[PDB]
Design a protein around this ligand. Structure first.
Ligand SMILES: O=C(O)C1=NO[C@H]2CN[C@H](C(=O)O)[C@@H]12
Ligand SMILES: O=C(O)C1=NO[C@H]2CN[C@H](C(=O)O)[C@@H]12
Ligand SMILES: [Li+]
Ligand SMILES: [Li+]
Lengths: 263, 263
């Protein structure tokens, strides 16, 4: 049939997609900025489609409710036919891969530790061997799952603590985790993806730090409905853009050129 | 039809696949050891197949001859029907993705610099601004292509030098590049994947070093013939093994537990 505008679903997560400060004055795709806004433009160019950016209606990434079996978030919008492509920091996982198609990674990352500067923690082992400093993860996401699935003693000890800690150590969003680190006076550490951690470390008030190495190695992928004809071209575009350096150019633009914490 | 033993193609590249020292005394899959030997066993277990490891007949990874348009190496064995799956450090690239199916990455990596210890080079920029120390890449591979495709001034300067340097700065294999670093008295530096670089740094005679950060971010994938029914299960197995920590366990086993250069 005739071509139609492609509906892109994405999520407000800095610096991937942000409302421009003057968005009330703008319309359409021009309302948004960030790494994934720039990536969407490049993918559309390299696949030859016109597109409309939309923010996922429920504000969520995508998980399946254990009781109703309904997918929420961006994954749900793809699964149920409400969007054509998701361009966001959507971690490639087994459970999602079974229901949607993913490009090869456009960004690589791993689980990492965020502290308020001066917190006496250098490693996951340090967290696991003390109790004064609480620590947790995003409540719905791949970081929590790493701990749930681990057979490594340190990470098992961490999961046993986190899963039962009161008050809850799990947070609703990255912004909530960061705020909790910043406001808990060194008594909360946040486990999150290295990409977000490294971004926040270069944001005012410049009071957080990434500590230690990454605990694993994963990727973000562009997602399409399973079997969608768009997936092949999107995947080729990701590889081509990576090979020509464009993805690293965008990362440097949004993480470091725009850093607020010095050079 | 009835199930058949799956033919796995792989390549002798340390520590991914190596002949055991006593291989003359062994038969079948037991002749080989390494990260990809262990990974093949896990993939076969998690997909429910029996398999035979084979070493690619021509000893090559996979590139297309510009004149005959014939694919060589492991990619060729898949394309032309001589093997069912390739389990090796095969970098996921646009040109290969067009002709074979790739799992999501089982290992993440980037281009890196190897020096003989004491060479006065800390970065790619350092290499690009001098001439006494020659430098190059594997003659057929993704590292060379990064330089060919770059628009970054430093990397463009490096490519302009490498492509015309005499004698050739390009090497046949990783082992040749390492030997050239080790034997050139500080006057050759080798650009190679971080995975190989980090392995060699922990091998006797402990005379090489990785310097600087990685220049890009890429992945190794398990490859199957395009459209092969095996690809779906293989990809799920990679994600599942990553999520449960097995891939990192194997990396640590083969890179660092077995390191020869101290603790
Ligand atoms: O689990 C985490 O640490 C996460 N942080 O941000 C979200 C984006 N990637 C993960 C996902 O896709 O589930 C989520
Ligand atoms: O290009 C390089 O630096 C490479 N080193 O080892 C080879 C394995 N991965 C790359 C490929 O698949 O072409 C090759
Ligand atoms: Li999928
Ligand atoms: Li492919």
């Amino acid at each position: 049939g005739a071509n139609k505008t492609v509906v892109v679903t994405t999520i407000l997560e800095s610096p991937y997609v942000m409302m421009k400060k003057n968005h009330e004055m703008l319309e359409g795709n021009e309302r948004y900025e960030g790494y994934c806004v720039d990536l969407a433009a490049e993918i559309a160019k390299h696949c030859g489609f016109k597109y409309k950016l939309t923010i996922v209606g429920d504000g969520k990434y995508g998980a399946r409710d254990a009781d109703t079996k309904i997918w929420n978030g961006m994954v749900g919008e793809l699964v149920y036919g409400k969007a054509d492509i998701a361009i966001a920091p959507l971690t490639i996982t087994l459970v999602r891969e079974e229901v949607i198609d993913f490009s090869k990674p456009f960004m690589s990352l791993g689980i990492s530790i965020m502290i308020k500067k001066g917190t006496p923690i250098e490693s996951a082992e340090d967290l696991s061997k003390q109790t004064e400093i609480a620590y947790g993860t995003l409540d719905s996401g791949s970081t929590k799952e790493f701990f749930r699935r681990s057979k490594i003693a340190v990470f098992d000890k961490m999961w046993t603590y986190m899963r039962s800690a009161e008050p809850s150590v799990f947070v609703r969003t990255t912004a909530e985790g960061v705020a909790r680190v910043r406001k808990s006076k060194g008594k909360y550490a946040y486990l999150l993806e290295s990409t977000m951690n490294e971004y926040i470390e270069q944001r005012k008030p410049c009071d957080t730090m990434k500590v230690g190495g990454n605990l694993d190695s994963k990727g973000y992928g562009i997602a399409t409905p399973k079997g969608s004809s768009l997936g092949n071209a999107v995947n080729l575009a990701v590889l081509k853009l990576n090979e020509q350096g464009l993805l690293d150019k965008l990362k440097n633009k949004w993480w470091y050129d725009k850093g607020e914490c010095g050079s």
